Design a protein around this nucleic acid. Structure first.
Lengths: 49, 48, 195, 146
DNA sequence: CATCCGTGAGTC
DNA sequence: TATAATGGGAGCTGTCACGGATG
């Protein structure tokens, strides 16, 4: 769906490609890890905030 | 600021003498450190 | 309990941090009780027992490995046995694939759980081997394991007073000349920080 | 389900210490596990024995005479284990203080100074605790911390 | 040569 | 002062130009 909605541009295609990790779990964990370091990352504690 | 240090300094004394766990005693020491720091230079480290 | 003058700590450049050759971010984690710091270590006593201590640690790694290789075997036995028990029942071969992948998942966890133990025992031995003053042990469970095992061999403290001790055992004259030798070396970036 | 990534990413976060002095203390408490009702009873039993072996030697030291090398050492170990059990009970219900010290916030006294003074009451609470009554530790504690 | 933190930014 | 009670809570928002430590 990322390719569908934002595909009309090359700068978004260049972004999804340079994207480090894939996965719904891995994305939430990644954002959580950068937002609040120092706290145990559950798949349920990253979904919540 | 003086009142904050002496309060926490004299709480450290009670905690030390009561043979309190390291988790509580360390917590006091830290607060004391921030207490004395806040007196010397406020807002330098952390929120004022 | 002692407490550090904030002027000589947070003021940039950090005077204490320059004095003990301690990182500004590392100096924080010590004074404000977030990471332990090694104050002194009996380097001779470590050496005199180093051989004996190596052997002891070595037995543990094996005793951990031996249970792993044994525990894995028992599961491999029951995986093969259950896959044949669901064969005598005459289940669909595909329904055996679920059971097959289940076991391979279990064994993976067993191998990993033991691997983390080995890696813990590895990082423990490494840390004790290369233990010296001014080191920061930020992981607490390591330091606890480090104390219960080799507490006789080093002096570990935390907080402002730990920094006080560092200043006491500080050799000004020695650290001075040592820095002058780095100045005598041409290399710029390391001469900069030594200047 | 449990990926190797999360297992590494969990120890990465927990190891790093936050800048907030309030947050850092909250992080520390969460390590110790909450106590079962009967697990509390065990510690209570231990402290009693420990607190009692202490009262013995205290008055004996003043009067002079001391136990043999086998009795005193055996007596002494209870005193350590007793003093150790006390610290374990204080660490477990250490959350309890923080639970009802947050309510007195903004009254001219800092949060940390409240939690500490609360902990200070928890310490006295663990000494006068009695396990003969079928009451959990949490109730006799609360009245002491407030 | 360009970022990140700390310290400046008229008087009555 | 014995029912049982167990990990916070507001953030603050529109600078500016610079040196020094880090890249």
């Amino acid at each position: 769906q990322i390719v569908e909605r934002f595909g009309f541009s090359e700068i978004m295609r260049s972004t999804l490609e340079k994207d480090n990790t894939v996965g719904t779990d891995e994305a939430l964990l990644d954002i959580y890890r950068k937002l609040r370091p120092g706290e145990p990352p559950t798949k349920e504690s990253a979904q919540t905030l | 600021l003086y009142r904050r240090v002496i309060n926490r300094n004299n709480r450290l004394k009670r905690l030390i003498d009561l043979g309190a766990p390291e988790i509580i005693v360390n917590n006091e020491k830290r607060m004391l450190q921030e207490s004395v720091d806040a007196l010397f230079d406020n807002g330098r480290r952390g929120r004022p | 309990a002692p407490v550090t003058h904030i002027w000589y700590f947070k003021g940039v450049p950090s005077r204490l941090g320059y004095l003990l050759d301690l990182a500004p971010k590392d100096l924080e984690k010590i004074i404000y009780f977030a990471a332990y710091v090694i104050t002194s270590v009996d380097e001779e006593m470590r050496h005199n027992e180093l051989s004996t201590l190596e052997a002891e640690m070595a037995v543990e790694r094996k005793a951990v490995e031996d249970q792993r290789d044994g525990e894995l075997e028992a599961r491999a036995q029951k995986l093969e046995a259950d896959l044949a028990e669901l064969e005598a029942e005459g289940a669909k071969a595909d329904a055996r694939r679920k059971v097959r992948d289940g076991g391979e998942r279990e064994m993976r966890q067993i191998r990993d759980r033991a691997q983390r133990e080995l890696d813990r025992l590895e990082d423990i031995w490494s840390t004790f081997t290369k233990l010296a003053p001014k080191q920061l042990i930020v992981d607490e469970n390591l330091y606890r394991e480090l104390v219960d095992r080799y507490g006789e061999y080093f002096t570990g403290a935390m907080g402002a007073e730990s920094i006080q001790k560092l200043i006491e055992n500080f050799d000004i004259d020695a650290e001075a000349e040592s820095l002058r030798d780095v100045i005598r070396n041409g290399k710029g970036q390391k001469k900069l920080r030594a200047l | 389900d449990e990926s190797e990534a999360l297992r590494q990413a969990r120890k990465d976060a927990e190891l790093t210490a936050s800048a907030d002095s309030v947050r850092a203390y909250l992080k520390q408490i969460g390590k110790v596990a909450l106590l079962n009702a009967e697990e509390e009873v065990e510690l209570a039993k231990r402290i009693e024995a420990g607190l009692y072996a202490t009262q013995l030697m205290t008055e004996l030291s003043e009067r002079g005479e001391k136990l043999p090398a086998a009795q005193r050492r055996d007596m002494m170990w209870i005193c350590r284990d007793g003093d150790r059990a006390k610290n374990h009970l204080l660490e477990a219900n250490l959350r309890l203080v923080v639970s009802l010290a947050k309510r007195y916030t903004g009254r001219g006294m800092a949060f940390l100074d409240l939690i500490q003074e609360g902990n200070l009451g928890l310490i006295r609470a663990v000494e006068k605790f009695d396990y003969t009554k079928g009451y959990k530790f949490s109730t006799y504690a609360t009245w002491w911390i407030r």
